[PDB]
Amino acid sequence: VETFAFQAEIAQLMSLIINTFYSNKEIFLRELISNSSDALDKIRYESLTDPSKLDSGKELHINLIPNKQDRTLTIVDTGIGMTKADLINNLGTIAKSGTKAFMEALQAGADISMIGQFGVGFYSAYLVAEKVTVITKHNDDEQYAWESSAGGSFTVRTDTGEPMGRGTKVILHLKEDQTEYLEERRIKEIVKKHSQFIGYPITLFVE
């Protein structure tokens, strides 16, 4: 298990998300579904010039899986996935610029729901989760588990768990007061409200 420091700017963003009073927490789901959709668009387009990129799985979809026993909501996609370099180097580079812009927008009167416009919507997971675990597999790289409970550090390890083919699984370990996001009716309401035109099947699993 390797432990890494977030860039100061990203730690600052995470603290803002965790600490700011903001009741409209439900937007985390739209942000993660949007990320999944982008990842699916990316593998689909790449496969037009290299069909072998789908050898790791042809089906392009999103699953939402609540588990009341574990108190987790998992968002699974069969998108492009992330390499180790993405997790430790590349995504932090884009996150730095997006965070700066988002901060400027907030000072000028924007609100937290607009986070996705700045390309850093992933961190909205921390509106509802005390810990986020991400399992990811990109073609030609290993399966990794990324994890963070904020506090300025994240971990990465090679994942020896259930092989996933290709894609990303975001596992939200929900805060004690955010268990509404495990309820079928609530998730259905939110998907209908904010994610109705996503161009991939979204299957809401039941418990």
Instruction: Give the residue, chosen from 17, 80, 156, 171, that forms a contact with ligand 990 under the rule CB under 6 A.
Output: 80
- Binding track over 88-107 against ligand 990, x by CB under 6 A: ---x---x------------
Q: Is 205 annotated as a binding residue?
A: no
The two tokens of residue 146 are 């990324």
> How is the beta sheet containing 62-67 ordered, strand by strand?
2-5, 153-158, 143-148, 129-137, 167-174, 72-77, 62-67, 202-204
What is the residue type of 66?
A: P
The residues, ordered by sequence, that sit 6+ positions from 120 with a Cβ below 8 Å of its Cβ are: 13, 95, 98, 99, 102
Q: 3 - beta bridge partners?
A: 155
Pairing of strands 129-137, 143-148: antiparallel
Q: Is 77 annotated as a binding residue?
A: yes
For residue 77, state whether it binds ligand 990 (rule: CB under 6 A).
yes
What is the residue type of 90?
A: N
Q: What is the total count of residues that contact ligand 990 (CB under 6 A)?
A: 18
For residue 147, state whether it binds ligand 990 (rule: CB under 6 A).
no
For residue 144, state whether it binds ligand 990 (rule: CB under 6 A).
no
For residue 172, state whether it binds ligand 990 (rule: CB under 6 A).
no
Instruction: Give the residue, chosen from 26, 27, 29, 35, that forms a contact with ligand 990 under the rule CB under 6 A.
Output: 35
* Residues at the interface with ligand 990 (CB under 6 A): 35-36, 39, 77, 79-82, 87, 91, 95, 119-120, 122, 134, 146, 168, 170
Binding residues: 35, 77, 96, 122
